[PDB]
């Protein structure tokens, strides 16, 4: 389409938290019941540095706050804590211009869209909604993310739905290995008012896309609520590393707990003896 231009472009300073013990996922799709399993994959190490930003979804007031372009490294743990679905998606790639291919995973209200093209992205990717007073409902009618999209190699549009326009915790793990972009997700209703919640929750496999592209950077896409005229969303980013994890499955197959073997000498002995007992 045609990008909307902003004369005043700023971005909030980044802030740091900690990964606690989140980011664990199911490496294989194998049913495992009442057993400890060890695999070496790209995991988010326990108590890792986590950077977190805010997605300003309302202007109240002519300053455009932009999301920053972050490194991808070997993979990312992405989490967001918002009430209404402010976080809409991400763009992935290297140069993020028409010179290379770029991944676009966006969630407009109807369905989820996954495309890989030579995008010429906008300076400020925009997604707009306005309130339909006569229907008492929000309707998103602005989608200005890229100015060009040529020589596409991948396209995916899911079946239509209606997205509803107590905080929500949505977690993702992104892994780009052997030409496959593998995604894992988990949604739990959190009660916290500020910050990432401490706890454990195993992320289930969402989809792995044979995109076959190189990804070194990414950027987050959010929604803007157009108002006539303060509780913004927050997202969290951690980085995966090659680690050996000891995973615990219950009798139903759910990963209930894990041990980061290389975290400390206590866990190193936990994995050597293949037990979850710290009093040993």
């Amino acid at each position, epitope marked *: 389409s045609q990008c909307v231009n902003f004369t005043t472009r700023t971005q909030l300073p980044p802030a740091y938290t900690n990964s606690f013990t989140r980011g664990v996922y199911y490496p294989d799709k194998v049913f495992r019941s009442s057993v400890l399993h060890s695999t070496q994959d790209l995991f988010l190490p326990f108590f890792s540095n986590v950077t977190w930003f805010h997605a300003i979804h309302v202007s109240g007031g002519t300053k455009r706050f932009a999301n920053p372009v972050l490194p991808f490294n070997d993979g990312v743990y992405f989490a967001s804590t918002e009430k209404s679905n402010i976080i809409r998606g991400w763009i992935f790639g290297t140069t993020l211009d028409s010179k290379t291919q770029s991944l676009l995973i966006v969630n407009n209200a109807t369905n989820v869209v996954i495309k890989v093209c030579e995008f010429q992205f906008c300076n400020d990717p925009f997604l707009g909604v306005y309130y*339909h*007073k*006569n229907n008492k409902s929000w309707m998103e*009618s602005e989608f200005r993310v890229y100015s060009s999209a040529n020589n596409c190699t991948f396209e995916y549009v899911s079946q239509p739905f209606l997205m509803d326009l107590f905080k929500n915790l949505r977690e993702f793990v992104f892994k780009n290995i052997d030409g496959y972009f593998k995604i894992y997700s988990k949604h739990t209703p959190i009660n916290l008012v500020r910050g990432l919640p401490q706890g454990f929750s195993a992320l289930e496999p969402l989809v792995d896309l044979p995109i076959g592209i190189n990804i070194t950077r990414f950027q987050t896409l959010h929604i803007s609520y*157009l108002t006539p005229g303060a509780g913004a969303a927050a997202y969290y980013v951690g980085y995966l590393q090659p680690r050996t994890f000891l995973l615990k499955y219950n009798e139903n197959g759910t990963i209930t707990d894990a041990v980061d073997c290389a975290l400390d000498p206590l866990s190193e002995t936990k994995c050597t003896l293949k037990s979850l007992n710290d009093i040993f």
Partner: antibody
Amino acid sequence: EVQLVESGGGVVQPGRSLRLSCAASGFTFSSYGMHWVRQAPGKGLEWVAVIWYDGSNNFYADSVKGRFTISRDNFKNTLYLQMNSLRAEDTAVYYCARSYCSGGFCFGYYYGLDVWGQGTTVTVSS
Amino acid sequence: SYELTQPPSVSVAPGKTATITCGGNNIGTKSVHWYQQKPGQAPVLVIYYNSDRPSGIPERFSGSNSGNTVTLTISRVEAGDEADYYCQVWDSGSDHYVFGTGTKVTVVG
């Protein structure tokens, strides 16, 4: 004292150019997005172009794209329309109108063209 | 381009009501504005945001936008209401402000 004053219209042969003007007074000019809407004699309304409050964005009509240029001077409260390569089908009365911009956005969901100018007549004939 | 359909003419007796139909594609998702233009002068915004009246427009005018049925309504029609009426939207799918074809409202009498 809210008023819009168009000028610059005239009679012109095809190919020639013409610069329209729209002087605004009585309100905060830099708070409104400005439009051009033309009306051919005996015909309906046709939207020409829009420019946002600070001139950072502008959208043109397909019929005038590549030939018309819209601009605004915010320290003089004036809207402009440059019209090149004029054709007989550009003959109309040209109106300028304001519409409130929410908070850096002049899309037109919450506000419409609430104030219109008197208009200026443009005729293109051989 | 994006099409906005209107009936070319509507006739009504004084004191009765007139209904003007704006035809659009997925117009139930758009915000329709209405303009009155009496012959000889510039159009006047009479309904914006589908149903809001400006400060000076009398309460006889009203608009709706429900179930793909956007409609301008003028009750207690007077002879002074004889004008052309246009609906207008912002179509982001084409970066165009689109005006309807128009409706001439003559008062039978």
